Write a protein that binds this ligand. Structure first.
Ligand SMILES: CCCC[N+](CCCC)(CCCC)CCCC
Ligand SMILES: [K+]
Ligand SMILES: [K+]
Ligand SMILES: [K+]
Ligand SMILES: [K+]
Lengths: 106, 103, 103, 103, 103, 106
């Protein structure tokens, strides 16, 4: 089973600044990585698919890059509404797995 | 119409059906097998196309017994078919040759 | 019955025999070779099927001289056979064509 | 001249065209896909040759949908063609056999 | 003797020559290319057999331009040949069919 | 995306001596590595292609070796005109990437 390491656990940043959360795979998973955002007491919300493909309804502020073992979710100018938990999840190999998660902090 | 043409004709449609059900069943067979990659329809379909055409880069392959079974069927349908087009292409030539031979 | 059909017919049975003895001998040839993976009957059999059908994903392959020899034989039987079905499929078409040509 | 020969004849030229446009389009389709390797004309061309001839070592392969599509076309042209040479080679034999049969 | 049989006959001998010179030239082409593995006659020969028979597990493959060229030739000879046996096998059937048809 | 580590950043050497800059790939890239030289306020200048193939117009002093993950650019007898930045760049996998660069110092 694949391991999705997400460190740091928390990330401090100031308004409008650019933030980037890191997610590492225990082995090449290509581009089969997807991002989810979860706000306090919310349900997860698909943010990005296949590491760099955008989803409709998601701020153009949200972007992603990476391939193989090192992937990056990026917010280009943070802001209050962005405060949440961010998780990565691979579907390269069965069974799917989730990242330990990373908390945004403005 | 000309049998060998209906054949090649059929042959193609049928293959397309095997390719699809192949992709579908493959995913079904593979999911559940740790480390398996043949697990999402889209690639599973490209898996089947490279397999029928007998290329198969090894980018993806079944690791379960049922997954493989599907592989054997996709493989066999893939081969058989193209070989049928060939066969049919031969009847065509052999026939038009006679004609040019005034017979 | 129609030769070309007995052929394809035979051809299949024979292959199934080569596939089996292939799997059996392959394991026998490979065991003993450090880093070898072609070493348990079950997969060895799927190894032979992907090999006869000429696909071979590279998930498994012989690394010993005798292992390879078996590979060459499985490969050759695999090819030859299917090609025989093709050939036989062609006689079928070429013949039924004449008929439609009133000859 | 003999149709089956013009065919095999054509068949070859055409393939060479598919091989080239294949290499060209493949690079075009792949570039942009992270981790993609099918991204420089030269190897892309050797990629197409190993693919048409259905070998494909897995040293290189498309990972994009359009890249694959090109693959399917290269694969199919590759197969079809050689099979056409075969077919044509058969008309040749079948014909020269009649002659030796005094007909 | 029967042309199509001399052909398949020839076809085989010739292949064996291509397989050998292939192995020999491949090593010659590859040595000198960092990271190259197609560099000792013995495996180079098994490389050629898996390549002619179009299987090619990807355990070994050329990375030089001349190495590949040899690959393309081995590939093509491999294909062509077997297809010739097929073709020849078809003349055989088509002919013995006529006989059973009392013609 | 591939990482091209180039360390040290600087390299001290004496006239005529033989110098060798190291460039490491985050994963096998075969021979798909190429060298560029950039002098103060200049444009990059292809030095080597495919790790060991020479380019016309480049001092026979310039050589290169390596394959897989460890590559080496070598100057056989340095000299003033050689003072510059040296970068490696792979084209094994999309998207191309550049090395952090290494400064020569006589
Ligand atoms: C020496 C060629 C052997 C491979 N063939 C022919 C490919 C011609 C590019 C693959 C057919 C494609 C379904 C025949 C199947 C043999 C089992
Ligand atoms: K094949
Ligand atoms: K193959
Ligand atoms: K392979
Ligand atoms: K293969």
């Amino acid at each position: 089973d694949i391991l999705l390491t997400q460190s740091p656990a928390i990330l401090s940043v100031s308004p409008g600044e650019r933030v980037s959360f890191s997610c590492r795979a225990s082995q090449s998973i290509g581009t089969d990585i997807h991002w989810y955002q979860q706000r306090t007491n919310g349900s997860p919300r698909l943010l990005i698919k296949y590491a760099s493909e955008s989803i409709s309804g998601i701020p153009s502020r949200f972007s992603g890059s990476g391939s193989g073992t090192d992937f990056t979710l990026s917010i280009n100018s943070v802001e209050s509404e962005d405060i949440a938990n961010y998780y990565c999840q691979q579907s390269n190999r069965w069974p799917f797995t989730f990242g330990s998660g990373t908390k945004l902090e403005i | 119409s000309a049998l060998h043409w209906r054949a090649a004709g059929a042959a193609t449609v049928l293959l397309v059906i095997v390719l699809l059900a192949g992709s579908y069943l493959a995913v079904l067979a593979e999911r559940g097998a740790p480390g398996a990659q043949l697990i999402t329809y889209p690639r599973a379909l490209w898996w089947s196309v490279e397999t029928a055409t007998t290329v198969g880069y090894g980018d993806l392959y079944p690791v379960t017994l049922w997954g493989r079974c599907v592989a054997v069927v996709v493989m066999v349908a893939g081969i058989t078919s193209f070989g049928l087009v060939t066969a049919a292409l031969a009847t065509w030539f052999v026939g038009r040759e006679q004609e040019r031979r005034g017979h």
